[PDB]
Design an enzyme around this catalytic site. Structure first.
Site, short mmCIF file in Angstrom:
data_model
loop_
_atom_site.label_atom_id
_atom_site.label_comp_id
_atom_site.label_asym_id
_atom_site.label_seq_id
_atom_site.Cartn_x
_atom_site.Cartn_y
_atom_site.Cartn_z
N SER A 67 40.62 34.85 31.73
CA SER A 67 39.82 35.38 32.84
C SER A 67 39.29 36.80 32.69
O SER A 67 38.51 37.23 33.54
CB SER A 67 40.61 35.29 34.16
OG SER A 67 40.91 33.94 34.44
N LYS A 70 35.66 36.92 32.94
CA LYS A 70 34.96 37.01 34.23
C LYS A 70 34.24 38.36 34.40
O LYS A 70 33.23 38.44 35.11
CB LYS A 70 35.93 36.79 35.40
CG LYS A 70 36.42 35.33 35.48
CD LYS A 70 37.51 35.20 36.56
CE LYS A 70 37.90 33.73 36.82
NZ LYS A 70 38.54 33.08 35.68
N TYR A 153 40.97 33.07 44.71
CA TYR A 153 40.60 33.25 43.30
C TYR A 153 40.31 31.90 42.68
O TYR A 153 41.07 30.94 42.87
CB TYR A 153 41.75 33.99 42.61
CG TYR A 153 41.56 34.31 41.15
CD1 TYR A 153 40.52 35.14 40.73
CD2 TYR A 153 42.46 33.85 40.22
CE1 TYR A 153 40.35 35.47 39.41
CE2 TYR A 153 42.31 34.17 38.87
CZ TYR A 153 41.26 34.99 38.48
OH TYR A 153 41.09 35.31 37.14
N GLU A 274 38.24 44.34 39.30
CA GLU A 274 39.00 44.61 40.51
C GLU A 274 39.46 46.07 40.43
O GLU A 274 39.87 46.53 39.37
CB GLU A 274 40.18 43.64 40.61
CG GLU A 274 39.68 42.20 40.70
CD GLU A 274 40.78 41.17 40.56
OE1 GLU A 274 41.97 41.51 40.78
OE2 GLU A 274 40.44 39.99 40.26
N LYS A 314 41.31 44.01 34.84
CA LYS A 314 41.27 42.55 34.93
C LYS A 314 42.32 41.96 34.00
O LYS A 314 42.44 42.40 32.86
CB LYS A 314 39.89 42.01 34.55
CG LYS A 314 39.75 40.49 34.75
CD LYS A 314 39.63 40.18 36.28
CE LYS A 314 39.68 38.67 36.54
NZ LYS A 314 41.10 38.16 36.48
N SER A 317 44.43 35.00 30.99
CA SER A 317 45.33 34.25 30.09
C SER A 317 44.75 32.90 29.76
O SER A 317 43.91 32.37 30.48
CB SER A 317 46.72 34.04 30.72
OG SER A 317 47.21 35.19 31.42
P1 LIG Z 1 42.45 33.52 34.44
O1 LIG Z 1 42.98 33.90 33.10
O2 LIG Z 1 43.13 34.08 35.68
O3 LIG Z 1 42.28 31.95 34.62
C1 LIG Z 1 41.62 31.16 33.63
C2 LIG Z 1 42.62 30.34 32.85
O4 LIG Z 1 43.15 29.29 33.70
C3 LIG Z 1 43.36 28.11 32.95
N1 LIG Z 1 42.48 27.08 33.55
C4 LIG Z 1 41.41 27.15 34.36
N2 LIG Z 1 41.05 25.87 34.62
C5 LIG Z 1 41.91 25.06 33.97
C6 LIG Z 1 41.97 23.68 33.90
N3 LIG Z 1 41.10 22.75 34.53
N4 LIG Z 1 42.93 23.07 33.19
C7 LIG Z 1 43.85 23.82 32.51
N5 LIG Z 1 43.79 25.19 32.57
C8 LIG Z 1 42.82 25.80 33.30
C9 LIG Z 1 43.02 28.42 31.49
O5 LIG Z 1 44.22 28.83 30.83
C10 LIG Z 1 42.06 29.59 31.64
O6 LIG Z 1 41.97 30.41 30.50
#
Ligand SMILES: *P(=O)(O)OC[C@H]1O[C@@H](n2cnc3c(N)ncnc32)[C@H](O)[C@@H]1O
Length: 361
Positions: A67, A70, A153, A274, A314, A317
């Site tokens: 993220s 973003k 979020y 943020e 920010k 992960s």
């Molecule tokens: P940020 O690092 O706060 O969030 C993005 C990470 O969330 C996980 N993620 C988003 N959507 C999915 C889905 N559909 N399935 C599995 N993981 C998801 C990933 O690790 C992104 O990098």
């Protein structure tokens, strides 16, 4: 290794003292750390990028930043605003005919960007795994909250912001990002899709079971969490957010990403970034990056007044990676921490806060 000359850099002890415990405690295979102080970048590298090659991490190693992507997606959207292709108060369905008739007739681009459209979830439902199913998902989606009233979020939220901003500029997101935005940010080793020539520099991530993994494909992954970058390129992005860039439109876009929309506790939500009043307590920084703020709907409150010293940050992960960036323009300081293990956010915050406080002086 005694008998070797110790590193010459005066900041090495400060960074080691916060980072080395972290690597041992969470069994992190490798981490690239970059700090900014007095105009200059410093790189401190730890461990290995790829256990099969045994290659050490350097500031050229590519990591998934999840993220943290973003902030780049937000900058692309801000660039579309500066170019006049879209406005933050546009209804989202202005930029997608297939959205006309849906709740997105009455939700703005800004609300998508700032997770405040009304309760879009953290992730797409696992069944939503094609473009056609994605479109259907948004058309069926039932608002939980009135637009603007709550921060939830959300990858579908800012992912759609980034899709539609790219659409307003009449180019697909990934090539727009790679051919226009990243080069203007001086980020010549940053990718949505890592090319052949750069693959050897791409770390493997390591799961909790110590298995090598990289990010799984998903809908709007490019927009919501799809960047690979190095600590040196991300620190160049920090410097772009402090001293600016030569591309006039991109300069304005960067400034737009700093503007506050609303707050949740001590955190003010910008576009991607943020922010916090600085100096910031560890407690405040932890709360703004806490499970409550990440996973629950929180009501929107007045944004922090503009001006004075501000810290931007920010977290991000993926299953195999954990990233963090924080910087304070008014003090000319910043830190980038890229690891190939997804280790707890609280540990990222503690280490970064401690290092920045020493850098501030
Ligand atoms: P940020 O690092 O706060 O969030 C993005 C990470 O969330 C996980 N993620 C988003 N959507 C999915 C889905 N559909 N399935 C599995 N993981 C998801 C990933 O690790 C992104 O990098």
């Amino acid at each position: 290794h005694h008998g070797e000359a110790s590193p010459v850099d005066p900041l090495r002890p400060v960074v080691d003292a916060s980072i080395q415990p972290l690597l041992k405690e969470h069994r992190i295979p490798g981490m690239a750390v970059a700090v900014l102080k007095d105009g200059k970048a410093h790189y401190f590298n730890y461990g290995v990028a790829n256990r099969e090659s045994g290659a050490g991490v350097s500031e050229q190693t590519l990591f998934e930043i999840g993220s943290v992507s973003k902030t780049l997606t937000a900058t692309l959207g801000a660039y579309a605003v500066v170019k006049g292709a879209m406005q933050l108060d546009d209804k989202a369905s202005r930029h997608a005919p297939w959205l006309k008739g849906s709740a997105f007739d009455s939700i703005t681009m800004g609300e998508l960007a700032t997770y405040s459209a009304g309760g879009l979830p953290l992730q797409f439902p696992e069944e939503v795994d094609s473009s056609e199913k994605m479109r259907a998902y948004y058309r069926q989606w039932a608002p939980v909250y009135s637009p603007g009233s709550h921060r939830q979020y959300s990858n579908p939220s800012i992912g759609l912001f980034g899709h539609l901003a790219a659409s307003s500029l009449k180019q697909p997101f990934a090539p727009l990002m790679e051919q226009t935005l990243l080069p203007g940010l001086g980020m010549h080793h940053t990718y949505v899709n890592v090319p052949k020539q750069a693959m050897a520099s791409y770390a493997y991530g390591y799961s909790k079971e110590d298995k090598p993994i990289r990010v799984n494909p998903g809908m709007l992954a490019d927009e919501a969490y799809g960047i690979k970058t190095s600590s040196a390129d991300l620190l160049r992005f920090v410097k772009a957010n402090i001293g600016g860039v030569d591309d006039k439109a991109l300069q304005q876009a960067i400034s737009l990403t700093h503007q506050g929309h609303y707050s949740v506790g001590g955190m003010t939500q910008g576009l991607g970034w943020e922010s916090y009043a600085y100096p910031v307590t560890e407690q405040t920084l932890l709360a703004g990056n806490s499970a409550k703020v990440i996973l629950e709907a929180n009501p929107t409150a007045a944004p922090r007044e503009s001006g004075s010293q501000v810290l931007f940050n920010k977290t991000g992960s993926t299953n195999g990676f954990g990233a963090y960036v924080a910087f304070v323009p008014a003090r000319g300081i910043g830190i980038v921490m890229l690891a190939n293990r997804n280790y707890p956010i609280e540990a990222r915050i503690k280490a970064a806060h401690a290092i920045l406080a020493q850098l501030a002086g």
